[PDB]
Design an enzyme around this catalytic site. Structure first.
Site, PDB file in Angstrom:
ATOM      1  N   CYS A  30       3.789   5.135  10.834  1.00  0.00           N
ATOM      2  CA  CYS A  30       3.925   4.240  11.973  1.00  0.00           C
ATOM      3  C   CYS A  30       4.806   3.054  11.603  1.00  0.00           C
ATOM      4  O   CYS A  30       4.716   2.523  10.492  1.00  0.00           O
ATOM      5  CB  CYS A  30       2.558   3.749  12.453  1.00  0.00           C
ATOM      6  SG  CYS A  30       2.614   2.770  13.982  1.00  0.00           S
ATOM      7  N   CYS A  33       2.820  -0.531  12.080  1.00  0.00           N
ATOM      8  CA  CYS A  33       1.756  -0.721  11.096  1.00  0.00           C
ATOM      9  C   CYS A  33       2.310  -1.258   9.785  1.00  0.00           C
ATOM     10  O   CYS A  33       1.676  -2.096   9.135  1.00  0.00           O
ATOM     11  CB  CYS A  33       1.016   0.595  10.856  1.00  0.00           C
ATOM     12  SG  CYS A  33       0.011   1.169  12.240  1.00  0.00           S
TER      13      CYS A  33
END
Lengths: 105, 639
Positions: A30, A33
């Protein structure tokens, strides 16, 4: 100063923690993230007393996230004694995370 | 000769009423319009052309118009109306024969904007109307758009529910394109000689002054259309009793195949779609060897068998995935498909698999809805049950009430015998006698120096059809090194094969040239003469042999299945489920014939052999042709 969680050690370290637990439901692939990961490292140092930072990688622990209906990551969940107090999704900045935490504590 | 086209309410399955039809006579040079009350006079006008010994021109008539006029005359006028096969012609069949190579040619016509993209490959009347410049408008589109804008939607063909003066005019529109398409086909002198004006001759002269392929194709299309109407008897309950056993196996495996793993995102993956096995094997530590042109790793049956991972649970799960994909394939063909078998079973209890005759470049027809020519064989898993579902026993006799018997006859080694025929010109029937002497695979093994006879079997077909030197080498577990030497050795021990490519290259052609790793195989002659004399456009000289042999083999079978039924009719047997036998399926070199009694099947087997020898005698074949018959209830027994 951040706790890494598994599926087995999520029931006791978070739900039975009796305190403020901020769990990051993150992943390796991600983009947002990876951006909040340096921020959480500094949050753990400053909030070391009234809040505990924890992270759950949903790839090595695929059983916890469904029980909280994860529709997007990074997913920050401020646990308060086995209950979900507040939830926010997406890469918050250091100023935005500070505002979030000081409001719910 | 007269030219016509009709208009009905629906398709052959549920057609009930005749709307209109127009007949242009080449003698009168004037059209005649008929209306739903003139249906009786319409049937008379066709009979008059039969009485004179002329011809009747239809587009798609052998498959639709003529049998529909047979069906419509029984329920509406209660009269028997049957057009003989000798005095009726189907331009659609000739189009697939004469201009199999046209698109192809249509690339510039497609770029031109003259030819619709939805009619890109259609031999239909509408597709031809724009080609002749006779398309003033289509009745299919001028109705659909009128359903949207002028009120009330629609689902599938409602522009035929009842007659209208615009249909009567577009019925004429279909006729003049049919006439012009006929004259466009009669102006091709490779099939129709110029010395004869076929627009004004008797039926006896038309077939004989035309190329042999022309005569066969109308006999072929007529025969195969009967088989479609004959259909293949089908045990619906049996396939249903398998979908239960497979879906349960799929469901039980699906449950078990979530036990090993283990997965803005959610997760639910099951064995299907390339993002499945690829996502797990790249977690069990699998390094892909062979890739694809898009980049994605190859995940076929071949590589899956060799996938080795250190994880025993993951490794043992591979064979469980192997089963799953296979389960879906059978399910997806017999139940869970848009063209599944269970969806095509009509009210009679038979599957009417359609077939496009020589509408396939060289030889064997094309099958679809459903493809009767890809039912899993008896050697594949669950195929035994599948083949058993296609059997004459699944149709009881409308009279005696007995289960009919099935007769399966195939062309014994048709491919290599065709090869023996073209190379008997250089070895004086040497290779041809090796077939008759037997064990041609043993001789090919010695000629190409192979360790086992099975290695010779897989070699002879691959080598003949243009295989690389890697693929040939992979037979003995090697590469292009052993491959090149295996092919060169076979050529040295079999001179006739190489000399065959001389006579072909000296027919003549052009010359080729390689530029830095690009195959620039050009040619002067891109059309091989067949056994019936048709043009077989073939491809580059890199193979071409495969086309020549398959053209020979499939055209032999076309005459074979024609001559057999002609003899069966000649011997007195009757074709149709109310007769004695019925053609159910034609597969390349084998056919499936339903038979009322075992005794009838025995005659069929002998007759099929007799026709195969007549075909070999008719075209003066240099090698001997033979067949083998098997009697039984279903397809799993006759093959």
């Amino acid at each position: 100063k951040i706790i890494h969680l598994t599926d087995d050690s999520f029931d006791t370290d978070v739900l039975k923690a009796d305190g403020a637990i901020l769990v990051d439901f993150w992943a390796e692939w991600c983009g947002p993230c990876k951006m909040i990961a340096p921020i959480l490292d500094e949050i753990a140092d400053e909030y070391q007393g009234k809040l505990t930072v924890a992270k759950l990688n949903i790839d090595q622990n695929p059983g916890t996230a469904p029980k909280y209906g994860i529709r997007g990551i990074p997913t920050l969940l401020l646990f308060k004694n086995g209950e979900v107090a507040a939830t926010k999704v997406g890469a918050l900045s250091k100023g935005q995370l500070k505002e979030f935490l000081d409001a719910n504590l | 000769m007269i030219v016509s086209a009709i208009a009905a309410n629906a398709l052959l399955e549920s057609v009930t009423k005749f709307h209109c039809g127009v007949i242009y006579d080449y003698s009168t040079a004037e059209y005649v319009s008929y209306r739903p009350s003139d249906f009786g006079a319409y049937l008379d006008a066709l009979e008059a052309e039969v009485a004179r010994g002329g011809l009747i021109v239809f587009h798609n008539g052998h498959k639709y118009d003529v049998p529909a006029l047979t069906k419509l005359a029984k329920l509406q006028l209660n009269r028997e109306f049957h057009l003989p096969r000798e005095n009726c012609i189907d331009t659609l069949v000739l189009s697939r024969l004469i201009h199999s190579n046209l698109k192809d040619t249509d690339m510039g016509l497609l770029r031109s904007g003259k030819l619709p993209g939805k009619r890109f490959g259609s031999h239909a009347l509408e597709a031809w109307g724009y080609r002749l410049g006779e398309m003033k408008g289509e009745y299919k589109d001028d109705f659909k758009r009128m359903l949207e804008e002028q009120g009330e939607e629609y689902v599938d063909g409602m522009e035929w529910w009842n007659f209208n003066e615009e249909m009567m005019d577009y019925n004429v529109q279909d006729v003049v394109v049919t006439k012009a398409l006929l004259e466009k086909l009669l102006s091709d002198k490779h099939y129709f000689p110029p010395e004869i004006d076929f627009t004004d001759v008797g039926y006896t002269t038309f077939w004989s002054e035309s190329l042999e392929a022309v005569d066969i194709e109308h006999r072929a299309a007529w025969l195969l259309a009967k088989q479609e109407r004959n259909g293949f008897p089908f045990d619906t309950k049996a396939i249903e009793e398998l979908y239960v056993e497979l879906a349960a196996r799929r469901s039980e495996l699906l449950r078990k195949l979530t036990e090993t793993f283990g997965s803005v995102e959610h997760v639910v993956f099951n064995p299907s779609s390339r993002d499945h096995i690829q996502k797990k094997l790249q977690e069990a530590g699998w390094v892909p060897t062979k890739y694809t042109d898009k980049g994605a790793p190859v995940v076929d049956d071949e590589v899956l068998e060799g996938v080795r991972v250190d994880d025993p649970e993951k490794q043992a799960a591979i064979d469980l995935i192997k089963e799953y994909l296979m389960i879906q394939k059978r399910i997806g063909q017999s139940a869970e498909g848009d063209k599944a078998w269970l969806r095509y079973v009509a009210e009679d209890g038979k599957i009417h698999g359609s077939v496009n005759p020589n509408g396939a470049v060289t030889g064997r027809a094309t099958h679809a809805f459903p493809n009767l020519a890809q039912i899993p064989g008896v050697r594949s898993p669950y195929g035994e049950q599948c083949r058993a579902a296609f059997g004459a026993e699944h149709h009881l006799d409308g009279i005696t009430g007995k289960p009919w018997v099935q007769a399966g006859i195939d062309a014994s080694g048709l491919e290599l015998r065709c090869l023996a025929h073209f190379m008997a010109r250089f070895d004086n029937g040497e290779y041809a006698h090796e077939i008759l002497n037997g064990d041609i695979h043993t001789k090919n093994q010695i000629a190409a120096e192979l360790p086992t006879r099975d290695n010779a079997k897989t070699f002879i077909y691959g080598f003949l059809y243009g295989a690389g030197d890697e693929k040939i080498g992979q037979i003995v577990g090697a590469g292009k090194e052993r491959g090149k030497e295996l092919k060169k050795k076979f050529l040295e021990n079999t001179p006739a094969i190489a000399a065959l490519r001389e006579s072909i290259q000296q027919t003549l052609v052009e010359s080729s040239q390689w530029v830095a790793g690009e195959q620039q195989v050009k040619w002067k002659r891109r059309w091989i003469k067949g056994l019936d004399g048709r043009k077989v456009h073939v491809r580059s000289p890199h193979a071409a042999l495969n086309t020549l042999l398959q053209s020979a083999g499939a055209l032999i079978c076309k005459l074979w299945i024609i001559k057999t039924e002609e003899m069966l009719v000649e011997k007195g047997l009757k074709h149709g489920w109310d007769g004695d036998f019925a053609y159910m399926a034609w597969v390349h070199d084998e056919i499936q014939v339903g038979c009322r009694t075992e005794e009838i099947a025995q005659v069929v087997i002998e007759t099929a052999q007799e026709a195969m020898r007549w075909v070999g005698d008719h075209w003066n074949f240099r090698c001997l042709l033979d067949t083998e018959g098997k009697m039984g209830p279903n397809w799993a027994i006759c093959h």
